[PDB]
Design a protein around this ligand. Structure first.
Ligand SMILES: Nc1ncnc2c1ncn2[C@@H]1O[C@H](COP(=O)(O)OP(=O)(O)OP(=O)(O)O)[C@@H](O)[C@H]1O
Ligand SMILES: Nc1ncnc2c1ncn2[C@@H]1O[C@H](COP(=O)(O)OP(=O)(O)OP(=O)(O)O)[C@@H](O)[C@H]1O
Ligand SMILES: [Mg+2]
Ligand SMILES: [Mg+2]
Ligand SMILES: [Mg+2]
Ligand SMILES: [Zn+2]
Ligand SMILES: [Zn+2]
Lengths: 503, 500
């Protein structure tokens, strides 16, 4: 029947702040926007600051990527909280969750073939007009000749006047400047302004102490990881396979696959029952809706609905033939021994980092300096609201216990206890007895550390990860000294890791 | 001007699951419903499991309280995401928690001459393909049980939707849940079609302990009881519990955790963050108040300006209050291994067993010390799940201040002079291990018993009485000064402490 007269769960002003409160990690709030840029299939995100002293915080936070962009339908689907194979976005709210943690308002400029769209979700408009609902101006211009593209001219006029009133771009030419800030035919520019302040009135994002970095505006104690104080260090290891370049203030971050930056990286295949059970659970949930859709078609659109969903059922049963094991990669961190811990990636995105499991939890000299990296998929684990924890805490703890057992196995097979922990760390540049000090940066110790680590670097245009046989600049495969991968059309040489057997 | 034709941000079906994903702590998801019942000024919540084999999980999860209840207006404001000395300020927590526990939830509330059902069912949206979040909202008169609505076809659709997807398939089956509220005002929240684990069992274990709601897992010896037992979690969920928590009809022995500690000393820490956030709160609310009075100078703007100056006059009285943070530190002697900081935000527990200061270092000193702070809402705000804090920098500043106050407390309590291993072993901890419980021998049990005063709560007046030595009344208090329910409530006389 018709439910037009029934009550609907609506949105209010304060729920933007409520959605903002999930991020105790403001770098996680940034990380959700760069996640959306990765979901755009972008080759490059520029995360730069535009100095605007008239706004709160003194500057805007602009997120410019060259991705697929958005049509008016997808742009209208942003403010629909929630959505309808390797993408990060599954919750449909994380842009709104992050941008309100970062700043009071955010304005989104995007472009996709001949339609380019502005999304101006403004909390300052809601304060200054006292409107309880979440009213979002969404005007669309033609991407070539710039006429308004809408079915409601007075609605377009109201939206654009609202943008020129509360946006940092008070004119249509200043809007067009942000629209041609996107260089390609498609892309998205997300500008977050009126940033959150501390008690002293300074913005939380420190962009002044390091001009090539977005920093946490606080002091740095001894035991604080650089990923929680530096967004450069966070975005370097934010992805388990970073194909898209990230530019902070126009400077590319040296991203790294954490498995290749480890001494003796051994790979472990852990057959997870959580992998197998929910892979078997998703095939009956998909077959249940396929049965009711088939009898619904048993007119043309209902038949086509079941026909294009029948191939979805063939895809998930094909995935059952793939073995349900998890890739446990363990390697010793020699460049920083103290920056060890477990780096849990969920569908190639860092959720939990620097986690101590197994004998790392025990207070003791051994099993320290090991970095464990895993890419769990979405059917094994789902992220939390902030994508900094895991929703299934019980099987997350099961994963941590299994990874502790695999850590103990990795520690006993590489035989550091047989060869000596103390002299092993002494010969690798670590002379002081303190754990948290960086190693000695002399020439022989630096060459000893860099001899074990293969130098991996990413090209600028083909975006492939090359290896060099003994704030980065722009790098192409042409100046690779290795003649096997001296061209951009060469196949990307995958990381080769020794295999370890656990029990 | 008018913005009726302008686009609005909407809610979709999958946002209920997205909102549900904020609760890594399922006991936090339960605790949000307990928080809403505390905001109801309920004297008693009832947490009970109604066994229903036709639903997922095998049983219903019921949240019955005798609070203020809801009228149709604030019952409709429940599904308005984001609303409002109350814990609830995010307008979200019931919707996040109930969808963390179960696929659907049906809410029965009653207030004054009216009573209202709130059905929000993800089963209805799944079986009907509904993209939006459609909530049936019928309202009955609390005496005559007639439909109180201006749209009888909408009422018929809402009620038939409840009878189709709710566990209560008839009007009489709905009415049984409506008279399950005993008083004139109250709220019954039913969570059904609960989330299963990998083995198909529900996540909430109600079978191993029939008086408790537990995590359905094998618990190692390092697990805190509040992370695996909802009875132990709701015992310390509030810093001043006037609620009577009832789990499966059994009253939870709640406690203010400060008085259950050996030698508790109080530290009044002057927080500059408390002073600074109060100093911007005074300048912000009058700015809203002065522009509300200008526009009201048409009757709706005066009502907005009257409640704005009510807030504006309230905070000016609170600025002259001493902007200090009350740090309470005590030694946990019934369980040495269950130590750590218990940070309460607006009298609601957020962080449990936080090791700060010398507890961070793996070592023998400052072990067994439990710190308790009632952080106001002016200092910090909770996260989406209310299991962390939004301001991580100021939370870490608070933790460092609590660490240095822990060091001050440790040098104050003179365990630095009376021996470290001679103090713990005479208190029942003969073993060299850390995580084992103390000795159950009678002289050690009585030695631990006489230090902590027995602070237990009456059932009618809800006051906390101390015994000098079940369902308990102030009449069988052996103390002659507090043998009646009309007696003045006696606070804990915890001595003050000074730093440096
Ligand atoms: N910069 C961008 N480029 C392309 N698409 C974008 C961009 N930002 C947002 N989107 C799209 O906008 C929609 C809504 O954004 P949002 O980030 O809230 O959703 P989501 O990525 O699906 O969610 P989440 O990350 O919480 O799972 C998504 O479909 C997302 O793909
Ligand atoms: N058992 C209850 N008794 C009385 N009022 C209730 C009850 N449960 C919910 N409510 C009301 O429901 C409204 C919205 O519910 P919700 O719990 O999401 O809001 P909130 O408590 O303000 O939010 P939060 O706790 O996340 O800050 C609140 O204003 C609250 O008063
Ligand atoms: Mg997203
Ligand atoms: Mg593009
Ligand atoms: Mg709430
Ligand atoms: Zn190349
Ligand atoms: Zn009494």
């Amino acid at each position: 029947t018709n439910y037009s007269s029934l009550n609907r769960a609506q949105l209010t002003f304060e729920y933007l702040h409520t959605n903002s409160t999930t991020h105790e990690f403001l770098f996680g709030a940034l990380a959700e926007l760069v996640d959306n840029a990765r979901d755009a299939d972008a080759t490059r995100i520029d995360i730069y600051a535009e100095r605007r002293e008239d706004l709160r915080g003194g500057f805007m936070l602009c997120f410019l990527d060259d991705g697929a962009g958005m049509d008016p339908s997808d742009a209208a689907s942003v403010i629909q909280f929630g959505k309808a194979s390797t993408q990060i976005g599954q919750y449909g709210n994380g842009l709104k969750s992050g941008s309100m943690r970062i700043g009071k308002d955010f304005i989104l400029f995007t472009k996709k073939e001949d339609t380019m769209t502005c999304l101006f979700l403004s909390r300052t408009f809601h304060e200054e007009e006292g409107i309880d609902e979440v009213i979002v101006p969404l005007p669309t211009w033609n991407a070539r000749t710039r006429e308004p593209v809408t079915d409601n001219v007075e609605k377009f006029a109201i939206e654009t006047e609202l943008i020129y009133k509360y946006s940092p771009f008070r004119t249509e030419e200043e809007v067009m400047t942000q629209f041609m800030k996107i260089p390609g035919d498609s892309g998205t520019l997300v500008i977050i302004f009126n940033l959150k302040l501390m008690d002293n009135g300074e913005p939380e994002l420190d962009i002044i102490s390091n001009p090539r970095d977005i920093q946490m505006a606080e002091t740095s104690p001894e035991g604080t990881k650089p990923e929680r104080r530096s967004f450069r260090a966070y975005a370097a290891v934010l992805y388990i396979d970073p194909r898209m370049r990230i530019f902070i203030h126009g400077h590319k971050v040296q991203t790294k696959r954490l498995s290749c930056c480890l001494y003796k990286p051994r790979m472990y295949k852990y057959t997870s029952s959580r992998f197998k059970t929910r892979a078997e659970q998703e095939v009956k949930k998909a077959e249940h809706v396929a049965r009711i859709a088939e009898e619904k078609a048993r007119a043309i659109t209902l038949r086509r609905e079941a026909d294009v969903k029948k191939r979805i059922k063939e895809a998930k049963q094909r995935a059952l033939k793939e073995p349900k094991e998890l890739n446990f990669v363990f390697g010793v961190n020699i460049e920083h021994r103290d920056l060890d811990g477990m780096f849990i990636y969920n569908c190639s995105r860092l959720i939990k980092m620097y986690e101590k499991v197994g004998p790392q939890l025990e207070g003791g000299m051994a099993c320290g300096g090991v970095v464990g990296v895993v890419d769990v998929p979405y059917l094994v684990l789902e992220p939390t609201h902030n994508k900094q924890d895991f929703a299934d805490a019980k099987e997350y703890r099961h994963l941590l216990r299994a990874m502790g057992e695999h850590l103990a196995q990795y520690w006993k097979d590489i035989a550091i206890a047989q060869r000596g922990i103390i002299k092993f760390w002494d010969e690798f540049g670590y002379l002081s007895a303190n754990w948290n000090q960086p190693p000695s940066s002399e020439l022989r110790y630096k060459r000893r550390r860099a001899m074990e680590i293969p130098t991996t670097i990413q090209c600028d245009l083909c975006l492939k990860w090359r290896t060099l046989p003994f704030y980065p600049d722009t790098w192409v495969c042409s100046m690779n000294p290795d003649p096997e991968q001296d061209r951009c059309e060469a196949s990307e040489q995958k990381q080769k890791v020794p295999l370890g057997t656990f029990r």
